[PDB]
């Protein structure tokens, strides 16, 4: 199962 | 920008036996950036409808791909892999050698 997105760079 | 040239290996899925169906593989690895042109050749001509793996990469971030096609080897037919990459002035051709 993949990770949710985090904040951008 | 730092770029890395592909390593190339050409080989069969199973030990080759003339007249018995098999898979011809061209494994390209260790390259960066990811754009790469790979052809499988039969007696110098491009084989149609070659498939390849999904783009992935190694722990050092360099990319790898497997290009493959069904083939039935014979004594007379010569097979090769032709690779182009931004790091290469001219396409690189690696011949299939049953013992490699």
């Amino acid at each position: 199962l993949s990770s949710p997105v985090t904040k951008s760079f | 920008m730092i770029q890395r040239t592909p390593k190339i290996q050409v080989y069969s899925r199973h030990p080759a036996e003339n007249g018995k169906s098999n898979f011809l593989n061209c494994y390209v690895s260790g390259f960066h950036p990811s754009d790469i042109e790979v052809d499988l050749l039969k007696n110098g001509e491009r084989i149609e409808k070659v498939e390849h793996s999904d783009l992935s990469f190694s722990k050092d971030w360099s990319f790898y791909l497997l290009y493959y096609t069904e083939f039935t080897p014979t004594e007379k037919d010569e097979y090769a892999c032709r690779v182009n990459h931004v790091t290469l002035s001219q396409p690189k051709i690696v011949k299939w050698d049953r013992d490699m």
Partner: protein, 276 residues
Amino acid sequence: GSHSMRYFYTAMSRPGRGEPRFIAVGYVDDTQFVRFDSDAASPRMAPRAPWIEQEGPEYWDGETRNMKASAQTYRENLRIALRYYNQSEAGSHIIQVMYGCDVGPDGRLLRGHNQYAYDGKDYIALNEDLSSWTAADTAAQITQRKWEAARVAEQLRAYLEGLCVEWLRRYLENGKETLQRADPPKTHVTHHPISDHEATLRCWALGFYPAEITLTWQRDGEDQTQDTELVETRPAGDRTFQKWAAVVVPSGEEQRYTCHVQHEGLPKPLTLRWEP
């Protein structure tokens, strides 16, 4: 044995040729089990191993939603990186991401990973503590400061110690027939003269899974590292891997050389010699 789950993302800009391509692949150990590609006619998280096919629509719909959102975020990250490195909008650039978890035989977390690269060089990495960051340069330090402010590491830690481990354990059970089977290498030694004075001995390993293997040549019991040609381990296309190791030897001295093979599938390391 021990096992890993890994996701690998590649985001590649291509100015003048549309939006950046985003490709994600997922692996358990050396087995790919999912893929997503924004250049597909209908982009979707799609199965690539038999044991994931049983997941239901909620799985496939949620993973597809996540991959689409990730592609948008990594397209933004490519634009941000251009700024941080003072780069032109004309060139093609690449962000890569690797993350996942390693578990022991008991299913217990051994460690997590979450690392990023820009144009093939380290950018930022989550440290083994799952709480602090290592930035490669002053550009990634800007990301580090932003991620410290937003407590991103806490979110990643929660994923890596929780859902990552729990779903890895689920996949290992559902795929136990293959994921928990080591296939030992099939081995042999070939001999080819290269001149009147020398011949090549090549030690072959074929048909093995997982990919990790050690192949070594010894002369009179001493490792020949500098004189051994080793090819990279390579996929056969049927889940298994191949590797060979070769040494050039003086004619008549062949029996001084022994090939040694270590693989998880072997109860005991193998010793092989050329058999004429």
